[PDB]
Design an enzyme around this catalytic site. Sequence first.
Site, PDB file in Angstrom:
ATOM      1  N   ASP A 146       0.841  -1.187   0.000  1.00 40.88           N
ATOM      2  CA  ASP A 146       0.000   0.000   0.000  1.00 40.88           C
ATOM      3  C   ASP A 146       0.882   1.245   0.000  1.00 40.88           C
ATOM      4  OD1 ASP A 146      -2.183   1.741   0.081  1.00 40.88           O
ATOM      5  OD2 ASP A 146      -2.962   0.936   1.971  1.00 40.88           O
ATOM      6  N   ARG A 150       0.210   8.876   1.628  1.00 37.85           N
ATOM      7  CA  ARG A 150      -0.475   8.778   2.920  1.00 37.85           C
ATOM      8  C   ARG A 150       0.219   7.784   3.859  1.00 37.85           C
ATOM      9  NH1 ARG A 150      -3.567   6.412  -0.860  1.00 37.85           N
ATOM     10  NH2 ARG A 150      -3.483   4.133  -0.764  1.00 37.85           N
ATOM     11  N   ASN A 151       1.053   6.898   3.306  1.00 36.90           N
ATOM     12  CA  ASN A 151       1.774   5.891   4.097  1.00 36.90           C
ATOM     13  C   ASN A 151       3.275   6.166   4.130  1.00 36.90           C
ATOM     14  OD1 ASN A 151      -0.435   4.353   4.957  1.00 36.90           O
ATOM     15  ND2 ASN A 151      -0.598   3.424   2.916  1.00 36.90           N
ATOM     16  N   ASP A 196       4.374   1.405   7.655  1.00 32.93           N
ATOM     17  CA  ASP A 196       3.307   0.402   7.629  1.00 32.93           C
ATOM     18  C   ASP A 196       3.409  -0.571   6.461  1.00 32.93           C
ATOM     19  OD1 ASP A 196       2.396   1.281  10.045  1.00 32.93           O
ATOM     20  OD2 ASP A 196       0.950   2.685   9.180  1.00 32.93           O
TER      21      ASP A 196
HETATM   22  C1  X9P Z   1      -0.020  12.509  11.873  1.00 32.77           C
HETATM   23  C2  X9P Z   1       1.108  13.243  12.584  1.00 32.77           C
HETATM   24  C3  X9P Z   1       2.264  12.737  13.020  1.00 32.77           C
HETATM   25  C4  X9P Z   1       2.705  11.462  13.008  1.00 32.77           C
HETATM   26  N1  X9P Z   1       3.936  11.102  13.388  1.00 32.77           N
HETATM   27  C5  X9P Z   1       3.981   9.762  13.345  1.00 32.77           C
HETATM   28  N2  X9P Z   1       5.020   8.958  13.600  1.00 32.77           N
HETATM   29  C6  X9P Z   1       4.846   7.593  13.456  1.00 32.77           C
HETATM   30  C7  X9P Z   1       3.624   7.087  13.030  1.00 32.77           C
HETATM   31  C8  X9P Z   1       2.552   7.944  12.791  1.00 32.77           C
HETATM   32  C9  X9P Z   1       1.355   7.437  12.218  1.00 32.77           C
HETATM   33  C10 X9P Z   1       1.395   6.392  11.287  1.00 32.77           C
HETATM   34  C11 X9P Z   1       0.237   5.961  10.622  1.00 32.77           C
HETATM   35  C12 X9P Z   1      -1.005   6.551  10.851  1.00 32.77           C
HETATM   36  C13 X9P Z   1      -1.037   7.638  11.742  1.00 32.77           C
HETATM   37  C14 X9P Z   1       0.116   8.042  12.429  1.00 32.77           C
HETATM   38  C15 X9P Z   1      -2.231   8.304  12.069  1.00 32.77           C
HETATM   39  C16 X9P Z   1      -3.283   8.142  10.976  1.00 32.77           C
HETATM   40  C17 X9P Z   1      -3.425   6.666  10.638  1.00 32.77           C
HETATM   41  C18 X9P Z   1      -2.130   6.242  10.020  1.00 32.77           C
HETATM   42  N3  X9P Z   1      -2.184   4.883   9.427  1.00 32.77           N
HETATM   43  C19 X9P Z   1      -2.292   3.753  10.138  1.00 32.77           C
HETATM   44  O1  X9P Z   1      -2.273   3.758  11.371  1.00 32.77           O
HETATM   45  C20 X9P Z   1      -2.179   2.600   9.440  1.00 32.77           C
HETATM   46  N4  X9P Z   1      -2.419   2.394   8.130  1.00 32.77           N
HETATM   47  C21 X9P Z   1      -2.149   1.096   7.829  1.00 32.77           C
HETATM   48  C22 X9P Z   1      -2.310   0.429   6.449  1.00 32.77           C
HETATM   49  C23 X9P Z   1      -2.054  -1.073   6.550  1.00 32.77           C
HETATM   50  C24 X9P Z   1      -3.735   0.666   5.949  1.00 32.77           C
HETATM   51  C25 X9P Z   1      -1.318   1.025   5.458  1.00 32.77           C
HETATM   52  N5  X9P Z   1      -1.678   0.437   8.884  1.00 32.77           N
HETATM   53  O2  X9P Z   1      -1.692   1.447   9.992  1.00 32.77           O
HETATM   54  C26 X9P Z   1       2.786   9.282  12.905  1.00 32.77           C
HETATM   55  N6  X9P Z   1       1.991  10.362  12.735  1.00 32.77           N
HETATM   56  C27 X9P Z   1       2.938  13.744  13.589  1.00 32.77           C
HETATM   57  N7  X9P Z   1       2.219  14.857  13.467  1.00 32.77           N
HETATM   58  N8  X9P Z   1       1.097  14.550  12.811  1.00 32.77           N
HETATM   59  C28 X9P Z   1       0.003  15.479  12.570  1.00 32.77           C
HETATM   60  C29 X9P Z   1       0.527  16.909  12.433  1.00 32.77           C
HETATM   61  C30 X9P Z   1      -0.981  15.408  13.743  1.00 32.77           C
END
Ligand code: X9P
Length: 266
Positions: A128, A132-133, A146
């Site tokens: 994927d 976004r990833n 991821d």
């Molecule tokens: C957002 C952010 C950060 C930030 N730093 C980070 N460091 C390490 C990891 C994350 C992190 C990684 C992933 C996700 C998020 C956060 C949040 C949204 C969902 C996303 N996706 C999955 O969780 C997810 N997707 C999948 C698939 C299998 C579908 C590909 N598996 O897990 C970090 N986010 C820092 N600032 N910000 C904003 C100004 C708030």
Amino acid sequence: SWEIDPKDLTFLKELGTGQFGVVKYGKWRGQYDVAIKMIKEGSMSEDEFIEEAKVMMNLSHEKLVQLYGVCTKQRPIFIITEYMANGCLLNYLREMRHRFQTQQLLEMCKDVCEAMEYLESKQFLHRDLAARNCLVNDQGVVKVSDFGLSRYVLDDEYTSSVGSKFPVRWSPPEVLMYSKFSSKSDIWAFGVLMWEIYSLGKMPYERFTNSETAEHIAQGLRLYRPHLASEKVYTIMYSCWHEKADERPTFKILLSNILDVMDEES
Ligand SMILES: Cc1c(-c2nc3nccc(-c4ccc5c(c4)CCC[C@@H]5NC(=O)c4nc(C(C)(C)C)no4)c3[nH]2)cnn1C(C)C
């Protein structure tokens, strides 16, 4: 080796919500920044993930978000990773204040390509790959996040090729038609990611639905050159979109091509 004691975690801020639920920023032992996925019940094939986490622990590259460990004794389980202070690449690209230079854009592509070349050397698919990833650290380095986790998602809307959450716009014809994933479907997605970077996070095929996109790429339609992409850069992304999978480059070849363009356009 893989187990982290969740009592060593201090939760500080919420980062967002994704396929597996909430992700938080916190500290490990009062000191070290970490991200913490809190895996919502029902969202993940947990036993299979836990077995794979042992393999993922051994994957280590500067441009890959590092898995530090897991917390599996109580539900919800946690996945503990490297924290990336500047957030998701897609959002980062969309903040126009950065006013990126084309050299910075190519460097983002190279960061991702280095990560993907490493995964390819381990015969490990991302599955994927998309802006976004990818994540961005406080120094502006992009890292891939991821990788592989799609295998453990329980949601049919994500997994099914006709599902609402399936990454149609990042998929080659043989995935859309036969759900045939390979190294070469990661290559196709990487080309779309390059396009996303040079388009500053526009949606690929922004005027089409997923259904229309699938039909159009089967008919040979492709994305076209972003305004900020040179002809040489566009040639690289376009090479990822050969109809025949075996004619697409490897990540090693892409990396060599990106480095050559950096040397030519600096
Ligand atoms: C957002 C952010 C950060 C930030 N730093 C980070 N460091 C390490 C990891 C994350 C992190 C990684 C992933 C996700 C998020 C956060 C949040 C949204 C969902 C996303 N996706 C999955 O969780 C997810 N997707 C999948 C698939 C299998 C579908 C590909 N598996 O897990 C970090 N986010 C820092 N600032 N910000 C904003 C100004 C708030």
